[PDB]
Amino acid sequence: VCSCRLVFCRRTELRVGNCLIGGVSFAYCCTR
Amino acid sequence: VCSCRLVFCRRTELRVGNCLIGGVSFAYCCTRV
């Protein structure tokens, strides 16, 4: 499962890419 | 729930922004809940 997070991904997650929502950029974070 | 989809969201989803993965843009598509 993947989520856009404002700052860092979770310990259990890898930073797979980026999101752009309403002008704000997010880490795109997925569990492996 | 939100999903990163090439080109189109599903009819159950609203396009809220964009993903960028591996140099590629995707629509970021969310269901209401």
UniProtKB/Swiss-Prot annotation, chain B:
Q: What is the effect of changing R11A?
A: Decreased antibacterial activity against E.coli. Weakens interaction with B.anthracis lef and with HIV-1 gp120
What happens when you mutate F8A? Decreased antibacterial activity against S.aureus
Tissue expression notes = Expressed in neutrophils (at protein level). Expressed in bone marrow.
Q: Per UniProt, what does mutating R32A do? A: Slight decrease in antibacterial activity against E.coli and S.aureus
Compartments annotated for it: namely: Secreted; Cytoplasmic vesicle, Secretory vesicle
What does changing F26A do? Impaired homodimerization. Decreased antibacterial activity against S.aureus. Disrupts interaction with B.anthracis lef and with HIV-1 gp120
The UniProt-reported impact of R15A is: Decreased antibacterial activity against E.coli and S.aureus. Weakens interaction with B.anthracis lef and with HIV-1 gp120
**Disulfide bonds, paired cysteine numbers:** C2-C30, C4-C19, C9-C29
Q: Which domain of life is it from?
A: Eukaryota
Entry PTM: The three-dimensional structure formed by the three intramolecular disulfide bridges is indispensable for effective bacterial killing.
| Result of altering L6A | Slight decrease in antibacterial activity against E.coli
Q: What's the reported outcome of changing C9A?
A: Impairs bactericidal activity against E.coli and S.aureus
Q: Which residues form a coiled coil?
A: none
Briefly state the protein's biological role: Host-defense peptide that has antimicrobial activity against Gram-negative bacteria, and to a lesser extent also against Gram-positive bacteria and fungi. Exhibits antimicrobial activity against Gram-negative E.coli and E.aerogenes and Gram-positive S.faecalis, S.aureus and B.cereus and the yeast C.albicans (in vitro). Interacts with pathogenic surface proteins and toxins, such as HIV-1 surface protein gp120 and B.anthracis anthrax lethal factor lef. Protects blood cells against infection with HIV-1 (in vitro). Inhibits enzymatic activity of B.anthracis lef/anthrax lethal factor (in vitro).
Q: Tell me, how does this one assemble?
A: Homodimer; homodimerization seems to be required for killing S.aureus, but not E.coli. Interacts with CD4. Interacts with HIV-1 surface protein gp120; homodimerization is required for the interaction. Interacts with Bacillus anthracis lef; homodimerization is required for the interaction.
Q: Which family does it belong to?
A: Belongs to the alpha-defensin family.
Name the UniProt record assigns to this protein:
Defensin alpha 4
- Organism for this UniProt entry: Homo sapiens
